[PDB]
């Protein structure tokens, strides 16, 4: 599975995944239990994924692996690209506070949305709120 809707029901290693890139405490002020429909839409080599999280309601579209200096929710960036692998996104990276690997995946495999963002050996996931 993978298209449709998806969210971020829960969040493990999520706060510290954000933090490390430059995400200060302002997020601590209602910015963890929140966030939401990452949502996914399958396109011709792209995925207009939503991500109308608890803040910057919008959707993000990328022809599997495009480059955009988009700071992972207030940090500093996440250019490089992202992509999946049939059965699993990747988020990819090399934002700019450094040379990380957030790798905001989601993978998605049976009961899931393994957001699996492993910028440094932590990975932040829990899974969707699917919609």
From Swiss-Prot:
InterPro entries from the UniProt entry: Calycin, FABP2, Fatty_acid-bd, ILBP, Lipocln_cytosolic_FA-bd_dom
Effect on the protein upon substituting residue 121 to V: Large reduction in stability
Molecular function in Gene Ontology: fatty acid binding; long-chain fatty acid binding; long-chain fatty acid transmembrane transporter activity
Name the UniProt record assigns to this protein: Fatty acid-binding protein, intestinal
Record's subcellular location: Cytoplasm
Gene, per the UniProt record: Fabp2
Classification of source organism: Eukaryota, Metazoa, Chordata, Craniata, Vertebrata
Phenotype upon changing residue 44 to V: Small reduction in stability, impaired ligand binding
Induction field: By peptide YY.
């Amino acid at each position: 599975a993978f298209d449709g809707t998806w969210k971020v029901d829960r969040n493990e290693n999520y706060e510290k995944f954000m933090e490390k890139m430059g995400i200060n405490v302002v997020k601590r002020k209602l910015g963890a239990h929140d966030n939401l429909k990452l949502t996914i839409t399958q396109e011709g080599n792209k995925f207009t994924v939503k991500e109308s999280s608890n803040f910057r309601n919008i959707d993000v579209v990328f022809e599997l692996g495009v480059d955009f200096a988009y700071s992972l929710a207030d940090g500093t960036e996440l250019t490089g690209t992202w992509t999946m692998e049939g059965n699993k996104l990747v988020g990819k990276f090399k934002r700019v506070d450094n040379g990380k690997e957030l790798i905001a995946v989601r993978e998605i495999s049976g009961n899931e949305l393994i957001q699996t963002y492993t910028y440094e050996g932590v990975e932040a996931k829990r899974i969707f709120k699917k919609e």
